[PDB]
Amino acid sequence: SEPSPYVEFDRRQWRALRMSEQIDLLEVEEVYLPLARLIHLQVAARQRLFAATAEFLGDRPVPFIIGVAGSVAVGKSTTARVLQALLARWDHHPRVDLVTTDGFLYPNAELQRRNLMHRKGFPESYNRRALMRFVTSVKSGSDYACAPVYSHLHYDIIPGAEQVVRHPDILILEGLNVLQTGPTLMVSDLFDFSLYVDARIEDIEQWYVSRFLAMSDSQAVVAAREIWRTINRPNLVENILPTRPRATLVLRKDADHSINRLRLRKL
Amino acid sequence: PSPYVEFDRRQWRALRRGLGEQIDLLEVEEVYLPLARLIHLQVAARQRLFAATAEFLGEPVPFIIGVAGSVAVGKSTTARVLQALLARWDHHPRVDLVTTDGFLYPNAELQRRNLMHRKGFPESYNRRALMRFVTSVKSGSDYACAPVYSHLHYDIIPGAEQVVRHPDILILEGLNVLQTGPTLMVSDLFDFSLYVDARIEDIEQWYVSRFLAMRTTAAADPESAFSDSQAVVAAREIWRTINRPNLVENILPTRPRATLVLRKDADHSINRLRLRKL
Secondary structure (H helix, E strand, O other): OOOOOEEEEEHHHHHOOOOOOOOOOHHHHHHHHHHHHHHHHHHHHHHHHHHHHHHHHOOOOOOEEEEEEEOOOOOHHHHHHHHHHHHHOOOOOOOEEEEEOHHHEOOHHHHHHHOOOOOOOOHHHEOHHHHHHHHHHHHHOOOOEEEEEEEOOOOEEEEEEEEEEOOOOEEEEEOOOOOOOOOOOOHHHHOOEEEEEEOOHHHHHHHHHHHOOOOOOOOOHHHHHHHHHHHHOOOHHHHHHHHHHHOOEEEEEOOOOOEEEEEEEOO | OOOEEEEEHHHHHOOOOOOOOOOOOHHHHHHHHHHHHHHHHHHHHHHHHHHHHHHHHOOOOOEEEEEEEOOOOOHHHHHHHHHHHHHOOOOOOOEEEEEOHHHEOOHHHHHHHOOOOOOOOHHHEOHHHHHHHHHHHHHOOOOEEEEEEEOOOOEEEEEEEEEEOOOOEEEEEOOOOOOOOOOOOHHHHOOEEEEEEOOHHHHHHHHHHHOOOOOOOOOOOOOOOOOOOOOHHHHHHHHHHHHOOOHHHHHHHHHHHOOEEEEEOOOOOEEEEEEEOO
16 A cells, blocks of 8 residues: 555446436436536635635635646536536525636737647647736636637637626636646645546547537548647647646546546545 | 735734753744634634534544755754744643654665655655655544655664554655655645745755755764865755755645745844735
Protein backbone atom coordinates (compact mmCIF):
# COMPACT_ATOMS: atom_id res chain seq x y z
CA SER A 1 0.00 0.00 0.00
CA GLU A 2 1.79 3.09 -1.37
CA PRO A 3 -0.54 6.07 -1.35
CA SER A 4 -2.08 7.79 -4.37
CA PRO A 5 -3.86 11.18 -4.14
CA TYR A 6 -6.79 9.93 -6.26
CA VAL A 7 -9.65 7.45 -5.77
CA GLU A 8 -10.74 5.62 -8.92
CA PHE A 9 -14.21 4.20 -9.54
CA ASP A 10 -16.09 2.47 -12.31
CA ARG A 11 -19.72 3.17 -13.14
CA ARG A 12 -21.16 0.54 -10.76
CA GLN A 13 -18.90 1.57 -7.83
CA TRP A 14 -19.77 5.28 -8.12
CA ARG A 15 -23.49 4.59 -8.85
CA ALA A 16 -23.76 3.04 -5.38
CA LEU A 17 -23.14 6.47 -3.74
CA ARG A 18 -26.65 7.80 -4.44
CA MET A 19 -28.51 9.41 -1.53
CA SER A 20 -31.61 7.39 -2.43
CA GLU A 21 -27.52 16.35 -29.44
CA GLN A 22 -29.00 13.80 -27.06
CA ILE A 23 -28.14 13.55 -23.38
CA ASP A 24 -28.43 9.93 -22.25
CA LEU A 25 -31.00 10.07 -19.45
CA LEU A 26 -29.70 7.00 -17.57
CA GLU A 27 -26.24 8.54 -17.01
CA VAL A 28 -27.87 11.42 -15.12
CA GLU A 29 -29.17 9.32 -12.20
CA GLU A 30 -26.08 7.06 -12.25
CA VAL A 31 -23.16 9.50 -12.81
CA TYR A 32 -24.24 13.17 -12.65
CA LEU A 33 -26.97 13.28 -10.01
CA PRO A 34 -24.47 11.74 -7.58
CA LEU A 35 -21.75 14.14 -8.76
CA ALA A 36 -24.10 17.04 -8.02
CA ARG A 37 -24.60 15.93 -4.39
CA LEU A 38 -20.82 15.92 -3.91
CA ILE A 39 -20.57 19.57 -5.03
CA HIS A 40 -23.54 20.60 -2.88
CA LEU A 41 -21.65 19.34 0.21
CA GLN A 42 -18.54 21.28 -0.76
CA VAL A 43 -20.38 24.49 -1.64
CA ALA A 44 -21.52 25.01 1.97
CA ALA A 45 -18.17 23.89 3.40
CA ARG A 46 -16.18 26.20 1.10
CA GLN A 47 -18.58 28.95 2.19
CA ARG A 48 -17.42 28.49 5.84
CA LEU A 49 -13.79 28.89 4.82
CA PHE A 50 -14.26 32.13 2.88
CA ALA A 51 -16.47 33.21 5.80
CA ALA A 52 -13.43 32.56 8.06
CA THR A 53 -11.10 35.01 6.26
CA ALA A 54 -13.97 37.50 6.64
CA GLU A 55 -14.43 36.88 10.39
CA PHE A 56 -10.63 37.31 10.66
CA LEU A 57 -10.59 40.67 8.85
CA GLY A 58 -13.55 41.86 10.96
CA ASP A 59 -23.41 40.69 1.59
CA ARG A 60 -24.77 37.35 0.40
CA PRO A 61 -22.26 34.48 0.14
CA VAL A 62 -19.35 34.14 -2.28
CA PRO A 63 -19.81 32.51 -5.70
CA PHE A 64 -18.74 28.90 -6.04
CA ILE A 65 -16.60 28.60 -9.16
CA ILE A 66 -16.71 25.38 -11.16
CA GLY A 67 -14.30 24.90 -14.05
CA VAL A 68 -14.95 22.33 -16.79
CA ALA A 69 -12.04 21.20 -19.00
CA GLY A 70 -11.30 18.75 -21.80
CA SER A 71 -10.61 18.72 -25.53
CA VAL A 72 -13.11 20.11 -28.02
CA ALA A 73 -15.92 17.68 -29.10
CA VAL A 74 -15.49 15.51 -25.95
CA GLY A 75 -18.71 16.93 -24.52
CA LYS A 76 -17.82 19.70 -22.06
CA SER A 77 -20.76 21.82 -23.22
CA THR A 78 -23.53 19.31 -22.50
CA THR A 79 -21.67 17.91 -19.46
CA ALA A 80 -21.71 21.37 -17.90
CA ARG A 81 -25.21 22.28 -19.21
CA VAL A 82 -26.54 19.26 -17.39
CA LEU A 83 -24.87 20.08 -14.05
CA GLN A 84 -26.41 23.57 -14.29
CA ALA A 85 -29.81 21.84 -14.31
CA LEU A 86 -29.25 19.48 -11.35
CA LEU A 87 -27.37 21.92 -9.09
CA ALA A 88 -30.06 24.60 -9.54
CA ARG A 89 -32.64 22.07 -8.28
CA TRP A 90 -31.30 22.41 -4.69
CA ASP A 91 -33.08 25.58 -3.47
CA HIS A 92 -30.43 25.78 -0.71
CA HIS A 93 -28.35 27.49 -3.40
CA PRO A 94 -30.01 28.13 -6.77
CA ARG A 95 -29.08 30.40 -9.63
CA VAL A 96 -26.24 28.49 -11.29
CA ASP A 97 -25.04 30.41 -14.31
CA LEU A 98 -22.95 28.89 -17.08
CA VAL A 99 -20.36 30.76 -19.12
CA THR A 100 -18.42 29.44 -22.08
CA THR A 101 -14.80 30.58 -22.33
CA ASP A 102 -15.12 30.67 -26.14
CA GLY A 103 -16.76 34.11 -25.96
CA PHE A 104 -13.39 35.35 -24.70
CA LEU A 105 -11.49 34.35 -27.81
CA TYR A 106 -10.31 37.28 -29.85
CA PRO A 107 -12.50 37.98 -32.87
CA ASN A 108 -11.08 36.35 -36.00
CA ALA A 109 -10.29 39.83 -37.39
CA GLU A 110 -7.92 40.32 -34.43
CA LEU A 111 -6.37 36.86 -34.78
CA GLN A 112 -5.66 37.65 -38.44
CA ARG A 113 -3.62 40.70 -37.43
CA ARG A 114 -1.57 38.67 -34.90
CA ASN A 115 -1.36 35.66 -37.30
CA LEU A 116 -2.97 33.16 -34.90
CA MET A 117 -5.77 31.56 -36.96
CA HIS A 118 -3.83 28.29 -37.17
CA ARG A 119 -3.39 28.43 -33.35
CA LYS A 120 -7.10 29.15 -32.76
CA GLY A 121 -8.25 27.72 -29.41
CA PHE A 122 -4.68 27.80 -28.02
CA PRO A 123 -4.02 29.85 -24.85
CA GLU A 124 -2.64 32.66 -27.07
CA SER A 125 -6.09 32.96 -28.72
CA TYR A 126 -7.93 34.27 -25.67
CA ASN A 127 -8.26 37.57 -23.84
CA ARG A 128 -6.98 36.41 -20.45
CA ARG A 129 -7.16 39.80 -18.71
CA ALA A 130 -10.71 40.36 -20.01
CA LEU A 131 -11.52 36.77 -19.02
CA MET A 132 -10.13 37.25 -15.52
CA ARG A 133 -11.30 40.78 -14.77
CA PHE A 134 -14.68 39.18 -15.54
CA VAL A 135 -14.18 36.09 -13.34
CA THR A 136 -12.53 38.20 -10.62
CA SER A 137 -15.55 40.50 -10.81
CA VAL A 138 -18.01 37.63 -10.43
CA LYS A 139 -16.39 36.12 -7.33
CA SER A 140 -15.83 39.53 -5.74
CA GLY A 141 -19.62 39.69 -5.47
CA SER A 142 -20.30 42.25 -8.21
CA ASP A 143 -23.99 43.13 -8.59
CA TYR A 144 -23.69 42.17 -12.24
CA ALA A 145 -21.04 41.22 -14.81
CA CYS A 146 -21.06 41.01 -18.62
CA ALA A 147 -19.39 38.33 -20.75
CA PRO A 148 -19.27 38.06 -24.57
CA VAL A 149 -20.43 35.15 -26.73
CA TYR A 150 -19.12 32.86 -29.49
CA SER A 151 -20.65 31.58 -32.73
CA HIS A 152 -19.78 28.03 -33.75
CA LEU A 153 -22.28 28.59 -36.56
CA HIS A 154 -20.87 31.92 -37.84
CA TYR A 155 -17.36 30.60 -36.94
CA ASP A 156 -16.48 33.66 -34.80
CA ILE A 157 -17.53 36.08 -32.04
CA ILE A 158 -21.05 37.53 -32.19
CA PRO A 159 -20.43 41.27 -32.10
CA GLY A 160 -22.26 43.25 -29.42
CA ALA A 161 -23.80 40.12 -27.92
CA GLU A 162 -23.70 40.11 -24.12
CA GLN A 163 -24.25 37.34 -21.58
CA VAL A 164 -25.06 38.90 -18.22
CA VAL A 165 -24.21 37.27 -14.90
CA ARG A 166 -26.17 38.55 -11.88
CA HIS A 167 -24.44 37.61 -8.58
CA PRO A 168 -24.91 33.83 -8.86
CA ASP A 169 -24.62 31.49 -5.87
CA ILE A 170 -22.72 29.20 -8.28
CA LEU A 171 -20.94 29.80 -11.57
CA ILE A 172 -19.77 27.23 -14.13
CA LEU A 173 -16.83 27.90 -16.44
CA GLU A 174 -16.69 25.71 -19.56
CA GLY A 175 -13.61 26.06 -21.76
CA LEU A 176 -10.72 24.42 -23.60
CA ASN A 177 -8.14 26.49 -21.78
CA VAL A 178 -9.46 27.03 -18.29
CA LEU A 179 -7.43 24.75 -15.98
CA GLN A 180 -4.35 26.59 -17.23
CA THR A 181 -1.50 27.97 -15.15
CA GLY A 182 1.12 30.62 -15.90
CA PRO A 183 3.27 33.57 -14.64
CA THR A 184 0.24 35.84 -14.54
CA LEU A 185 -2.39 35.02 -11.93
CA MET A 186 -4.97 32.86 -13.72
CA VAL A 187 -8.60 31.76 -13.72
CA SER A 188 -7.48 28.25 -12.75
CA ASP A 189 -6.32 29.69 -9.41
CA LEU A 190 -9.87 30.99 -8.78
CA PHE A 191 -11.70 27.65 -9.20
CA ASP A 192 -13.22 25.88 -6.21
CA PHE A 193 -13.84 22.65 -8.16
CA SER A 194 -12.46 21.36 -11.47
CA LEU A 195 -13.92 18.91 -13.97
CA TYR A 196 -11.92 17.23 -16.70
CA VAL A 197 -13.97 15.44 -19.36
CA ASP A 198 -11.55 12.89 -20.84
CA ALA A 199 -11.46 10.31 -23.61
CA ARG A 200 -9.05 8.52 -25.94
CA ILE A 201 -7.19 10.74 -28.48
CA GLU A 202 -7.42 8.71 -31.71
CA ASP A 203 -11.05 8.11 -30.58
CA ILE A 204 -12.10 11.76 -30.01
CA GLU A 205 -11.15 12.43 -33.64
CA GLN A 206 -14.18 10.39 -34.73
CA TRP A 207 -16.49 12.42 -32.44
CA TYR A 208 -15.16 15.77 -33.67
CA VAL A 209 -15.46 14.73 -37.33
CA SER A 210 -19.02 13.79 -36.28
CA ARG A 211 -19.47 17.11 -34.40
CA PHE A 212 -18.41 18.69 -37.64
CA LEU A 213 -20.51 17.22 -40.47
CA ALA A 214 -23.63 17.21 -38.23
CA MET A 215 -23.98 20.89 -37.47
CA SER A 216 -19.44 19.40 -49.28
CA ASP A 217 -21.22 16.42 -47.66
CA SER A 218 -18.62 13.77 -48.48
CA GLN A 219 -14.80 13.86 -48.53
CA ALA A 220 -14.93 17.28 -46.81
CA VAL A 221 -14.25 15.11 -43.78
CA VAL A 222 -10.75 15.41 -45.30
CA ALA A 223 -10.81 19.10 -44.30
CA ALA A 224 -12.34 18.32 -40.88
CA ARG A 225 -9.83 15.53 -40.17
CA GLU A 226 -6.96 17.92 -41.05
CA ILE A 227 -8.15 20.74 -38.74
CA TRP A 228 -7.85 18.04 -36.07
CA ARG A 229 -4.27 17.03 -36.98
CA THR A 230 -3.14 20.69 -37.24
CA ILE A 231 -5.11 22.63 -34.58
CA ASN A 232 -7.23 20.57 -32.17
CA ARG A 233 -5.00 17.47 -31.74
CA PRO A 234 -2.13 19.70 -30.81
CA ASN A 235 -3.35 22.01 -28.02
CA LEU A 236 -4.76 18.89 -26.39
CA VAL A 237 -1.28 17.34 -26.06
CA GLU A 238 0.66 20.46 -25.02
CA ASN A 239 -1.88 22.70 -23.30
CA ILE A 240 -4.93 20.72 -22.08
CA LEU A 241 -3.77 17.19 -21.18
CA PRO A 242 -1.06 18.46 -18.77
CA THR A 243 -3.85 20.07 -16.68
CA ARG A 244 -5.61 16.71 -16.14
CA PRO A 245 -3.85 15.83 -12.84
CA ARG A 246 -4.75 19.20 -11.30
CA ALA A 247 -8.48 18.50 -11.88
CA THR A 248 -10.73 17.76 -8.88
CA LEU A 249 -12.70 15.16 -10.83
CA VAL A 250 -11.98 13.20 -14.01
CA LEU A 251 -14.61 11.62 -16.31
CA ARG A 252 -13.17 9.12 -18.80
CA LYS A 253 -15.69 8.60 -21.59
CA ASP A 254 -15.61 5.37 -23.58
CA ALA A 255 -15.60 5.09 -27.40
CA ASP A 256 -19.40 5.41 -27.59
CA HIS A 257 -19.67 8.37 -25.15
CA SER A 258 -20.43 6.11 -22.17
CA ILE A 259 -18.59 6.95 -18.92
CA ASN A 260 -16.73 3.97 -17.42
CA ARG A 261 -13.97 5.34 -15.17
CA LEU A 262 -13.86 8.10 -12.51
CA ARG A 263 -10.62 9.30 -10.86
CA LEU A 264 -11.49 11.70 -8.00
CA ARG A 265 -9.14 13.94 -6.01
CA LYS A 266 -9.78 13.33 -2.29
CA LEU A 267 -6.62 15.16 -1.18
CA PRO B 1 -11.98 44.41 -8.65
CA SER B 2 -8.64 42.86 -7.69
CA PRO B 3 -8.35 39.37 -6.14
CA TYR B 4 -5.91 40.62 -3.47
CA VAL B 5 -6.14 42.88 -0.40
CA GLU B 6 -2.99 44.92 0.33
CA PHE B 7 -1.95 46.18 3.77
CA ASP B 8 0.94 48.03 5.34
CA ARG B 9 2.30 47.11 8.81
CA ARG B 10 0.04 49.58 10.61
CA GLN B 11 -3.13 48.40 8.81
CA TRP B 12 -2.46 44.68 9.37
CA ARG B 13 -1.18 45.30 12.90
CA ALA B 14 -4.70 46.47 13.87
CA LEU B 15 -6.18 42.97 13.28
CA ARG B 16 -4.86 41.48 16.56
CA ARG B 17 11.55 31.10 23.19
CA GLY B 18 14.11 30.67 20.38
CA LEU B 19 16.98 31.92 18.20
CA GLY B 20 17.95 32.48 14.54
CA GLU B 21 20.50 35.02 13.21
CA GLN B 22 18.29 37.37 15.14
CA ILE B 23 14.51 37.25 14.83
CA ASP B 24 13.16 40.74 15.51
CA LEU B 25 10.80 40.26 18.48
CA LEU B 26 8.51 43.21 17.66
CA GLU B 27 7.55 41.83 14.22
CA VAL B 28 6.15 38.72 15.92
CA GLU B 29 3.31 40.48 17.78
CA GLU B 30 2.73 42.89 14.86
CA VAL B 31 3.03 40.68 11.73
CA TYR B 32 3.30 36.96 12.59
CA LEU B 33 1.13 36.49 15.67
CA PRO B 34 -1.77 37.96 13.67
CA LEU B 35 -0.84 35.83 10.64
CA ALA B 36 -1.01 32.74 12.88
CA ARG B 37 -4.58 33.51 13.98
CA LEU B 38 -5.63 33.68 10.33
CA ILE B 39 -4.30 30.16 9.67
CA HIS B 40 -5.86 28.78 12.85
CA LEU B 41 -9.30 29.87 11.60
CA GLN B 42 -8.70 28.24 8.19
CA VAL B 43 -7.31 25.00 9.63
CA ALA B 44 -10.64 24.10 11.26
CA ALA B 45 -12.64 25.29 8.23
CA ARG B 46 -10.52 23.29 5.76
CA GLN B 47 -10.99 20.29 8.10
CA ARG B 48 -14.76 20.60 7.60
CA LEU B 49 -14.36 20.44 3.80
CA PHE B 50 -12.14 17.36 3.75
CA ALA B 51 -14.59 15.92 6.30
CA ALA B 52 -17.32 16.55 3.68
CA THR B 53 -15.73 14.38 0.94
CA ALA B 54 -15.48 11.73 3.66
CA GLU B 55 -19.14 12.00 4.70
CA PHE B 56 -19.97 11.76 0.97
CA LEU B 57 -17.94 8.57 0.42
CA GLY B 58 -19.47 7.03 3.57
CA GLU B 59 -17.03 6.11 6.35
CA PRO B 60 -8.03 14.79 11.06
CA VAL B 61 -6.13 15.50 7.85
CA PRO B 62 -2.81 17.38 7.91
CA PHE B 63 -2.91 21.06 7.06
CA ILE B 64 -0.17 21.74 4.53
CA ILE B 65 1.61 25.11 4.56
CA GLY B 66 4.03 25.97 1.75
CA VAL B 67 6.63 28.73 2.15
CA ALA B 68 8.28 30.19 -0.95
CA GLY B 69 10.76 32.89 -1.91
CA SER B 70 14.33 33.26 -3.15
CA VAL B 71 17.26 31.95 -1.14
CA ALA B 72 18.56 34.32 1.61
CA VAL B 73 15.23 36.24 1.80
CA GLY B 74 14.40 34.53 5.10
CA LYS B 75 12.04 31.62 4.41
CA SER B 76 13.81 29.44 6.98
CA THR B 77 13.34 31.71 10.01
CA THR B 78 9.96 32.96 8.73
CA ALA B 79 8.69 29.38 8.74
CA ARG B 80 10.62 28.40 11.87
CA VAL B 81 8.78 31.16 13.74
CA LEU B 82 5.28 30.16 12.53
CA GLN B 83 6.01 26.63 13.77
CA ALA B 84 6.42 28.16 17.24
CA LEU B 85 3.26 30.30 17.29
CA LEU B 86 0.92 27.78 15.60
CA ALA B 87 1.98 25.00 18.00
CA ARG B 88 0.92 27.26 20.91
CA TRP B 89 -2.80 26.71 20.06
CA ASP B 90 -3.51 23.35 21.79
CA HIS B 91 -6.58 23.05 19.54
CA HIS B 92 -4.07 21.72 16.98
CA PRO B 93 -0.49 21.20 18.11
CA ARG B 94 2.42 19.27 16.55
CA VAL B 95 3.40 21.51 13.70
CA ASP B 96 6.33 19.90 11.95
CA LEU B 97 8.64 21.74 9.57
CA VAL B 98 10.38 20.20 6.60
CA THR B 99 12.89 21.88 4.33
CA THR B 100 12.67 20.97 0.64
CA ASP B 101 16.49 21.17 0.40
CA GLY B 102 16.81 17.64 1.83
CA PHE B 103 15.15 16.52 -1.41
CA LEU B 104 17.87 17.88 -3.67
CA TYR B 105 19.90 15.19 -5.35
CA PRO B 106 23.27 14.63 -3.70
CA ASN B 107 26.06 16.55 -5.48
CA ALA B 108 27.52 13.27 -6.66
CA GLU B 109 24.28 12.69 -8.59
CA LEU B 110 24.10 16.24 -9.93
CA GLN B 111 27.67 15.81 -11.22
CA ARG B 112 26.61 12.80 -13.30
CA ARG B 113 23.63 14.70 -14.76
CA ASN B 114 25.74 17.90 -15.18
CA LEU B 115 23.45 20.11 -13.07
CA MET B 116 25.82 21.70 -10.51
CA HIS B 117 25.47 25.11 -12.20
CA ARG B 118 21.70 24.62 -12.15
CA LYS B 119 21.66 23.71 -8.41
CA GLY B 120 18.45 24.78 -6.66
CA PHE B 121 16.53 24.78 -9.98
CA PRO B 122 13.47 22.51 -10.33
CA GLU B 123 15.66 19.98 -12.19
CA SER B 124 17.82 19.64 -9.05
CA TYR B 125 15.21 17.95 -6.87
CA ASN B 126 13.67 14.52 -6.50
CA ARG B 127 10.04 15.46 -7.18
CA ARG B 128 8.62 11.94 -6.97
CA ALA B 129 10.49 11.28 -3.71
CA LEU B 130 9.37 14.71 -2.51
CA MET B 131 5.76 14.01 -3.42
CA ARG B 132 5.37 10.36 -2.33
CA PHE B 133 6.59 11.86 0.96
CA VAL B 134 4.12 14.78 0.99
CA THR B 135 1.34 12.56 -0.38
CA SER B 136 2.17 10.09 2.41
CA VAL B 137 1.95 12.80 5.07
CA LYS B 138 -1.45 14.13 4.04
CA SER B 139 -2.87 10.62 3.51
CA GLY B 140 -2.52 10.25 7.28
CA SER B 141 0.45 7.85 7.36
CA ASP B 142 1.49 6.84 10.90
CA TYR B 143 4.95 8.13 10.12
CA ALA B 144 7.02 9.43 7.20
CA CYS B 145 10.76 9.95 6.67
CA ALA B 146 12.42 12.89 4.90
CA PRO B 147 16.13 13.47 4.22
CA VAL B 148 18.23 16.48 5.23
CA TYR B 149 20.58 19.07 3.69
CA SER B 150 23.90 20.53 4.82
CA HIS B 151 24.52 24.20 4.04
CA LEU B 152 27.74 23.71 6.04
CA HIS B 153 28.95 20.59 4.18
CA TYR B 154 27.47 22.05 0.99
CA ASP B 155 25.44 18.88 0.24
CA ILE B 156 23.05 16.19 1.55
CA ILE B 157 23.86 14.55 4.90
CA PRO B 158 23.96 10.85 4.04
CA GLY B 159 21.75 8.55 6.10
CA ALA B 160 20.28 11.44 8.04
CA GLU B 161 16.51 11.14 8.53
CA GLN B 162 13.90 13.66 9.65
CA VAL B 163 10.81 11.79 10.82
CA VAL B 164 7.28 13.18 10.58
CA ARG B 165 4.71 11.55 12.87
CA HIS B 166 1.12 12.29 11.72
CA PRO B 167 1.20 16.05 12.39
CA ASP B 168 -1.95 18.17 12.71
CA ILE B 169 -0.06 20.75 10.63
CA LEU B 170 2.97 20.50 8.37
CA ILE B 171 5.12 23.33 7.00
CA LEU B 172 6.99 23.03 3.70
CA GLU B 173 9.88 25.49 3.26
CA GLY B 174 11.62 25.50 -0.12
CA LEU B 175 12.85 27.44 -3.15
CA ASN B 176 10.81 25.36 -5.56
CA VAL B 177 7.63 24.45 -3.75
CA LEU B 178 4.86 26.64 -5.23
CA GLN B 179 5.77 25.12 -8.62
CA THR B 180 3.41 23.71 -11.23
CA GLY B 181 3.92 21.29 -14.12
CA PRO B 182 2.57 18.37 -16.25
CA THR B 183 3.10 15.93 -13.39
CA LEU B 184 0.86 16.39 -10.36
CA MET B 185 2.86 18.54 -7.93
CA VAL B 186 3.33 19.43 -4.28
CA SER B 187 1.95 22.90 -5.02
CA ASP B 188 -1.42 21.26 -5.75
CA LEU B 189 -1.39 19.72 -2.23
CA PHE B 190 -0.95 22.97 -0.27
CA ASP B 191 -3.80 24.39 1.80
CA PHE B 192 -2.03 27.74 2.35
CA SER B 193 0.92 29.38 0.60
CA LEU B 194 3.43 31.96 1.82
CA TYR B 195 5.71 33.94 -0.45
CA VAL B 196 8.52 35.83 1.28
CA ASP B 197 9.41 38.66 -1.12
CA ALA B 198 11.93 41.48 -1.44
CA ARG B 199 13.73 43.50 -4.15
CA ILE B 200 16.12 41.65 -6.44
CA GLU B 201 19.16 43.98 -6.47
CA ASP B 202 18.56 44.23 -2.72
CA ILE B 203 18.44 40.49 -1.87
CA GLU B 204 21.92 40.17 -3.39
CA GLN B 205 23.27 42.12 -0.37
CA TRP B 206 21.56 39.78 2.06
CA TYR B 207 22.82 36.64 0.32
CA VAL B 208 26.38 37.96 0.15
CA SER B 209 25.82 38.60 3.89
CA ARG B 210 24.29 35.13 4.37
CA PHE B 211 27.45 33.87 2.74
CA LEU B 212 30.41 35.49 4.52
CA ALA B 213 28.67 35.12 7.91
CA MET B 214 28.24 31.41 8.13
CA ARG B 215 31.38 30.78 6.21
CA THR B 216 32.84 32.87 9.07
CA THR B 217 30.71 33.34 12.18
CA ALA B 218 30.55 29.55 12.69
CA ALA B 219 32.53 27.88 9.84
CA ALA B 220 35.85 29.11 11.00
CA ASP B 221 34.57 27.56 14.25
CA PRO B 222 35.33 23.84 13.96
CA GLU B 223 37.12 24.24 10.54
CA SER B 224 36.84 20.42 10.30
CA ALA B 225 35.95 28.85 3.54
CA PHE B 226 38.98 30.26 1.69
CA SER B 227 39.09 34.08 1.98
CA ASP B 228 37.56 36.82 4.18
CA SER B 229 37.78 39.65 1.68
CA GLN B 230 37.27 39.79 -2.10
CA ALA B 231 35.85 36.24 -1.95
CA VAL B 232 32.61 38.20 -2.02
CA VAL B 233 33.58 38.18 -5.73
CA ALA B 234 32.86 34.45 -5.75
CA ALA B 235 29.67 34.85 -3.69
CA ARG B 236 28.37 37.68 -5.90
CA GLU B 237 29.04 35.50 -8.99
CA ILE B 238 27.09 32.50 -7.67
CA TRP B 239 24.24 34.99 -7.40
CA ARG B 240 24.53 36.26 -11.01
CA THR B 241 24.85 32.71 -12.40
CA ILE B 242 22.69 30.45 -10.20
CA ASN B 243 20.48 32.18 -7.60
CA ARG B 244 19.48 35.35 -9.52
CA PRO B 245 18.28 33.22 -12.37
CA ASN B 246 15.89 30.62 -10.90
CA LEU B 247 14.28 33.52 -9.06
CA VAL B 248 13.31 35.23 -12.32
CA GLU B 249 12.23 32.14 -14.30
CA ASN B 250 11.09 29.61 -11.70
CA ILE B 251 10.21 31.31 -8.40
CA LEU B 252 8.88 34.81 -9.15
CA PRO B 253 6.17 33.50 -11.55
CA THR B 254 4.65 31.57 -8.60
CA ARG B 255 4.15 34.77 -6.55
CA PRO B 256 0.58 35.44 -7.74
CA ARG B 257 -0.60 31.93 -6.84
CA ALA B 258 0.53 32.48 -3.21
CA THR B 259 -2.14 32.84 -0.50
CA LEU B 260 -0.11 35.48 1.34
CA VAL B 261 2.79 37.72 0.27
CA LEU B 262 5.34 39.33 2.64
CA ARG B 263 7.37 42.12 1.02
CA LYS B 264 10.46 42.73 3.14
CA ASP B 265 12.18 46.12 3.01
CA ALA B 266 15.92 46.72 2.43
CA ASP B 267 16.70 46.19 6.13
CA HIS B 268 14.55 43.03 6.65
CA SER B 269 11.55 45.00 7.90
CA ILE B 270 8.17 43.96 6.48
CA ASN B 271 6.17 46.93 5.14
CA ARG B 272 3.63 45.54 2.61
CA LEU B 273 1.18 42.59 2.71
CA ARG B 274 -0.83 41.43 -0.32
CA LEU B 275 -3.35 38.76 0.78
CA ARG B 276 -5.52 36.51 -1.40
CA LYS B 277 -9.11 36.75 -0.14
CA LEU B 278 -10.52 35.02 -3.25
